[PDB]
Amino acid sequence: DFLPFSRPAMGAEELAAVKTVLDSGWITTGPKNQELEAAFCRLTGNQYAVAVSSATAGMHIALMALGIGEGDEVITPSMTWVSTLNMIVLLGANPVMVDVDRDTLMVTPEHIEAAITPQTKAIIPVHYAGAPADLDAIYALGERYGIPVIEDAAHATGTSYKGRHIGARGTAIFSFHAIKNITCAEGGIVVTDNPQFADKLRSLKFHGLGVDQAEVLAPGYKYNLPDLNAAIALAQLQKLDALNARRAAIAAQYHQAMADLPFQPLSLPSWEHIHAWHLFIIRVDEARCGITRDALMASLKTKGIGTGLHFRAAHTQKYYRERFPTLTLPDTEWNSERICSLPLFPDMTESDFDRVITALHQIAG
Numbered sequence: 001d002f003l004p005f006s007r008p009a010m011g012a013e014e015l016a017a018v019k020t021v022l023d024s025g026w027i028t029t030g031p032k033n034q035e036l037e038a039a040f041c042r043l044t045g046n047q048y049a050v051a052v053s054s055a056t057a058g059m060h061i062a063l064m065a066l067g068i069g070e071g072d073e074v075i076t077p078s079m080t081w082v083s084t085l086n087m088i089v090l091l092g093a094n095p096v097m098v099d100v101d102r103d104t105l106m107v108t109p110e111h112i113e114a115a116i117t118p119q120t121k122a123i124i125p126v127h128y129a130g131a132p133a134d135l136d137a138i139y140a141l142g143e144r145y146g147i148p149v150i151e152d153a154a155h156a157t158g159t160s161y162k163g164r165h166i167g168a169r170g171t172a173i174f175s176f177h178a179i180k181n182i183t184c185a186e187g188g189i190v191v192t193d194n195p196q197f198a199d200k201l202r203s204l205k206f207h208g209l210g211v212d213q214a215e216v217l218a219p220g221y222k223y224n225l226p227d228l229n230a231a232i233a234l235a236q237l238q239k240l241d242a243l244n245a246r247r248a249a250i251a252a253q254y255h256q257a258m259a260d261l262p263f264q265p266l267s268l269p270s271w272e273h274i275h276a277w278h279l280f281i282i283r284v285d286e287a288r289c290g291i292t293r294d295a296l297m298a299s300l301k302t303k304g305i306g307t308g309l310h311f312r313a314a315h316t317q318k319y320y321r322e323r324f325p326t327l328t329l330p331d332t333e334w335n336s337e338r339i340c341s342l343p344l345f346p347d348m349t350e351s352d353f354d355r356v357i358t359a360l361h362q363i364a365g
């Protein structure tokens with residue numbers, strides 16, 4: 001009975017939502033998409049939302065809508081999923097990778113500010129693992145230098161920063177991928193406070209069609225989310241508080257279990273926040289633990305326990321190593337070689353949980 005690091009919280013509600021859409025006959029983008037967008041605006045407090053086929057697609061059209069291209073620079077952490085770096089590169093722009101806090105894995109204002117040049121056209125902070133980045137300082141940077149801030153909120157559905165939801169202001173991209181806090185297998189949504197920007201996003205995710213009877217105003221891609229999938233996301237969104245509460249509860253126990261273990265969890269940010277607990281990441285330093293990260297992951301798999309690696313720093317991956325050979329980001333690299341994600345999902349039981357706790361104890365000796 002293998003225990004994966006994540007399982008989607010699919011139940012009767014999700015099946016019923018699909019059935020309703022199948023029975024209606026309107027299976028691709030339509031009313032369920034509009035409902036999901038309205039729901040995300042209510043959830044976050046922002047004004048406009050555009051549902052898309054993935055958070056990667058959302059990042060692509062957000063950067064494209066800003067007119068990012070050849071010659072432009074986009075500041076981003078290397079400690080993030082490679083999709084953002086790929087989208088920057090594929091638009092013809094130059095990714096400028098900066099380091100992150102050694103204990104929270106989040107991009108610092110200092111590191112961002114040091115990398116700003118006249119060619120900087122966007123800054124993309126990541127709300128890592130469910131915790132929020134330092135938005136006040138980051139927006140301050142954006143305002144001072146006149147550079148748009150696009151938040152990567154893929155890990156942050158349910159995250160709050162100093163009393164306000166992530167996505168309440170500015171622009172933020174959320175994900176409905178299978179391991180995320182809410183899922184429809186694949187999907188995402190861009191929430192924004194700018195109406196002209198939102199209109200551009202809606203056109204770019206559906207062939208560049210717009211009303212000048214719709215016709216191509218400027219070429220765009222096909223990134224629309226089917227109503228079949230949007231209805232699943234809507235059913236999951238209705239359960240968000242319960243689902244995140246179960247994640248937070250399991251986080252607490254891990255925290256308690258870590259007191260008697262050598263593995264080091266991430267540090268919480270110093271600012272006021274609500275953590276979505278998308279991931280429970282531990283650092284496995286060979287010298288301190290007596291076992292390496294890769295060895296630990298393999299040992300756990302022998303015991304029938306899955307783990308995740310979120311993430312192998314983008315600048316250490318083949319394409320990026322060869323393109324940016326001199327790039328060194330010490331805190332990112334230190335963490336990249338030592339992090340791993342322990343099983344954490346809404347339906348996880350204590351049979352599962354202490355199965356993991358006792359597997360760690362075996363390995364710690």
Ligand SMILES: Cc1ncc(COP(=O)(O)O)c(CN)c1O
Nearest residue numbers: 054055056081083152154175177
């Ligand atoms: C930090 C981050 N940003 C962007 C993405 C892309 O998400 P999607 O799978 O929805 O395209 C991910 C995927 N897990 C991610 O973890």
